[PDB]
Symmetry: C3
Subunit: 270 residues, 3 copies
């Protein structure tokens, strides 16, 4: 009778329309392109010096954007296999971290890597600590799905867990931004008028812009059928596809361009 | 008919009484307090020198006690949401590492971090190796729950897995204590009568005391309905709450006090 | 009606014969022996210098073969407990990473460690990156099991996921071998005729031989009931036991012998 968390739910027909299926295809294609591009950048990178063969091979923190895009691509491969077979893939079948049959179970793998990577660009403190908190926020979102989709007697568990996640998200942000802020401040005074100043401006704004676009995820939760229900389940899939293209692919391309142009300029100051 | 491992089990009414629910509330409050306290110590720590701003931010091994308390707090948040909704949370619903709807599934995340942290205080060898073995012991305990709570035809699987876990636990201990012993021995001769001797005495006894209190977990298993059944399921929840307050919170406060008083005294010798 | 992914499947009688049960016993005994042997080598190792007490304790990358054998031993302990109780253990019960009730769910823990260890022997670049890709390939194999064993309407999902895994496996190999190749090339010119040359020859061939034996896993998939069905489920269990003895135990013994004889000879060049 309740399908969430079961194999019975997995064998049902897909509830998704052409709009949601099209969004999954679009997201998979963009993530696959980004993965091959970031793979090429990883192979050919010689570092800021431009004299170290397989630089990204020895400094493997450089491959974090590649692995974010690669794991997101694997998750969307699963969504398009399920869509083309025409079976239900929403919060049914086996619970596997890094796989997106459970909403936010894919992000539990990729988001901690993405926050680590963002903070690593500014050599910011609390990188592992912010990855751990993001892991717990995404766990909160997974548990809110089980309550939201289960027996309506337990529905208020979804708000308890959303609230917990939002609490720690606001906390994490209000500490993260106060690190990104101090890291730019340190380097800004250090940079003086050297020309590294302009690249350092760009790095702070890019890292801040991509950080702040993460607020779209709890906002989509609030407007979708989990909260107010102003958008349906099909448009929620479209909202997540767009947010994933921005958070992972556009981030991946933006960072890859920064490393192409401004890496050495800041490698002396960072 | 058998509920362990199923969503059907999750929708049943809670089997817990007021004593077990009160123990969960008490444990959640203490873990939340410890988390905020250890968060404050992490933010304000300047290291043993007292001259490094955001020391714990760059030396993130210092945040391990914080993350143990934070993940235990998340697990107990889940128990009190389930208690207040009034649904069954004992070995039912989705299997998620770091979440305590399966007994020992929460500990699979926090215990390896806690053993790493203990051995890191003495700069002991085999820190990752001891974290790996503790992970396997807690896996053993998870698998013993599935056999203990399932079809009684398979009940003897619970003893096979408890035995496996106990075997490797005795092994791990009988090697760990022989490291803690040699690490104190090395530093004891090195310390001479310098005043660092007294702090080093305290560190060995504290690390040994907290290590030895981990024997309470397999002893609670033996006395609870899994073994002899001298205590019921409600008193087992109380026993785990008390053991968690000692193993995580009291450990967290004890370590934080050691770092406040004796960090620099031993940072020259460690 | 479909048992894959369910607790109902776990309570069924074993489908395995004496040949498959004997293979599980044989594999468990060999992995346990290898674990105790590699444990002894870890304890007594003094490094290439032969002057560092608990060398493997401080350089914990040396314990990777030990932890591969230890986790494989835990997985086979589970198979023999299930065989002796006489219950079904094939892709039923709880999904737990590092546990082999789901085919390839045990390997998701051990294979990334094993590829890290192989590449670490040659100080090869892309070690974490190759561990991440192997993790995704083994995830692909897990998802192909759910489709292969479920509702036959969704059977073609098994080929989609096998294809995805094979694609990234060929990719990973065709990049890995081009690293092992360049790492041997670098050291070969560096070694000249010093006597380190002969040991370096042995290391390249051993690492290449063990790397290439990993092709047996997707080949067994193709010949077993997942693909052409030339062998039955019982002989598939035997094929995996033999492949595990070679990939983990024989690897473990071969590496341990290399470190006994040729460690110092190459520690100056590596
Ligand atoms: C989406 C499916 C069909 C996979 C196709 C991936 C395509 C788009 C990938 C694979 C190889 C890639 C190319 C690899 C190398 C280079 C050289 C350099 O100048 C950067 C871009 C460029 C030219 C890449 C563009 C994207 C690319 C063409
Ligand atoms: C990047 C673009 C160009 C290529 C698309 C790649 C993937 C997503 C495509 C290519 C071929 C596809 C498969 C083609 C055939 C079948 C059989 C059908 O009964 C179920 C769907 C299934 C199993 C498809 C799933 C999706 C699939 C694996
Ligand atoms: C349990 C629920 C209600 C959450 C409440 C957490 C409370 C207990 C936390 C939040 C902020 C914390 C304080 C933060 C900072 C300091 C300064 C220093 O002198 C150590 C203790 C002290 C004074 C902390 C004591 C505990 C504290 C008051
Ligand atoms: C630390 C102390 C002071 C604060 C306690 C925090 C948490 C555990 C409390 C505060 C408010 C609580 C919620 C209040 C309202 C409801 C609706 C009810 O139908 C189910 C329980 C549920 C969902 C509660 C779960 C537990 C809860 C989230
Ligand atoms: C498979 C079950 C019964 C467990 C038994 C494990 C046995 C085979 C293990 C445990 C202790 C091990 C021994 C430990 C130490 C040494 C000394 C050295 O010269 C290497 C081999 C040798 C002699 C080992 C051989 C294997 C050994 C005997
Ligand atoms: C290495 C060799 C020498 C020792 C073998 C170790 C393990 C695999 C053996 C030793 C004793 C065995 C147990 C003996 C008794 C029972 C009770 C029976 O109703 C179910 C099987 C079960 C639970 C067995 C499972 C496997 C077991 C745990
Ligand atoms: C690649 C995907 C990214 C970067 C996703 C990030 C998602 C979040 C920050 C989600 C956060 C949420 C909360 C703050 C509350 C609980 C619900 C979530 C999971 C949507
Ligand atoms: C914060 C919680 C802690 C430190 C818990 C530690 C738990 C253990 C060491 C449990 C060990 C067990 C065995 C030795 C055998 C199997 C049963 C267990 C899991 C209770
Ligand atoms: C100890 C076990 C080892 C080293 C196992 C390795 C297994 C693989 C490389 C398996 C690979 C597969 C694919 C290439 C495609 C999908 C099916 C798999 C999982 C068999
Ligand atoms: C994780 C792998 C991503 C894809 C890798 C693409 C590498 C292309 C190599 C280019 C060779 C010149
Ligand atoms: C920081 C907390 C934010 C979330 C607040 C809970 C959402 C509203 C729950 C009540 C709905 C009726
Ligand atoms: C340390 C944790 C801090 C507290 C964070 C969680 C607090 C928010 C709980 C929200 C519960 C909302 C329940 C709504 C009930 C209703 O619909 O009437
Ligand atoms: C759709 C992608 C948006 C990317 C935003 C880029 C932000 C860069 C800001 C640099 C300003 C100088
Ligand atoms: C932390 C980022 C910002 C998140 C903004 C949260 C705004 C509150 C959303 C609550 C939605 C759940 C309650 C809706 C219930 C209903 O009216 O049906
Ligand atoms: C994981 C976060 C735990 C809680 C963090 C509390 C930090 C408080 C900061 C104090 C500012 C002076
Ligand atoms: C080291 C092994 C200790 C555990 C021994 C197994 C527990 C007793 C099982 C038999 C119960 C009847
Ligand atoms: C390397 C592994 C070492 C062995 C560790 C496990 C051995 C203990 C097995 C205990 C089985 C107890 C079964 C009791 C059967 C009964 O009740 O009659
Ligand atoms: C209830 C908490 C107990 C904590 C035990 C503290 C052990 C410290 C020993 C130091 C002796 C000098
Ligand atoms: C390794 C730490 C010490 C653990 C102490 C173990 C003591 C044996 C407990 C076995 C309990 C299981 C058998 C009870 C069966 C019964 O009598 O009903
Ligand atoms: C993970 C532990 C494996 C087994 C360890 C065996 C260690 C034996 C110690 C020998 C002492 C001389
Ligand atoms: C690199 C791709 C290899 C696997 C190809 C798919 C296997 C055949 C599927 C069709 C079976 C009818
Ligand atoms: C980036 C991903 C690359 C593509 C890798 C997967 C492509 C192989 C898909 C195989 C599908 C085979 C379906 C067979 C259908 C049938 O039986 O008729
Ligand atoms: C059955 C185990 C096989 C192990 C293969 C060993 C390969 C070593 C090659 C060295 C050649 C000089
Ligand atoms: C990447 C390593 C090599 C793998 C070799 C793959 C060979 C193709 C195997 C496809 C098997 C699945 C299709 C069989 C369908 C059938 O005929 O019943």
């Amino acid at each position: 009778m309740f399908y969430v968390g079961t194999m019975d739910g997995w064998y049902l027909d897909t509830k998704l329309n052409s709009v949601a299926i099209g969004a999954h295809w679009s997201c998979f294609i963009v993530l696959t392109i980004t993965t091959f591009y970031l793979g090429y950048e990883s192979w050919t990178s010689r570092g800021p010096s431009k004299r170290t063969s397989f630089y990204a091979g020895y400094q493997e923190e450089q491959n974090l954007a590649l692995f974010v895009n690669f794991f997101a691509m694997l998750s969307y491969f699963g969504k398009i296999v399920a869509d083309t077979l025409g079976h239900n893939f929403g919060d049914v079948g086996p619970f596997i971290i890094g796989f997106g049959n459970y909403r936010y179970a894919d992000y539990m793998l990729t988001c901690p890597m993405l926050v680590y990577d963002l903070l690593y660009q500014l050599r910011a403190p609390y990188r592992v600590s912010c990855s751990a908190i993001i892991f717990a926020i995404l766990m909160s979102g997974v548990l809110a799905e089980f309550y939201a989709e289960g027996d309506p007697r337990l529905r208020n568990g979804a708000y308890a867990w959303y609230g917990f996640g939002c609490f720690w998200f606001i906390f994490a942000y209000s500490i993260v931004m106060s690190i990104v802020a101090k890291q730019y401040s340190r380097l800004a005074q250090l940079a003086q008028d050297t020309g590294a100043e302009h690249s350092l401006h760009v790095l702070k704004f890019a890292v801040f812009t991509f950080s702040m676009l993460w607020i779209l995820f709890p906002l989509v939760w609030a407007i979708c059928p989990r909260g107010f229900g102003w958008i349906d389940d099909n448009w929620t899939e479209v909202a997540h596809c767009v947010c994933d293209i921005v958070a992972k692919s556009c981030y991946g391309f933006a960072l890859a361009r920064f490393r192409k142009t401004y890496d050495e300029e800041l490698f002396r100051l960072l």
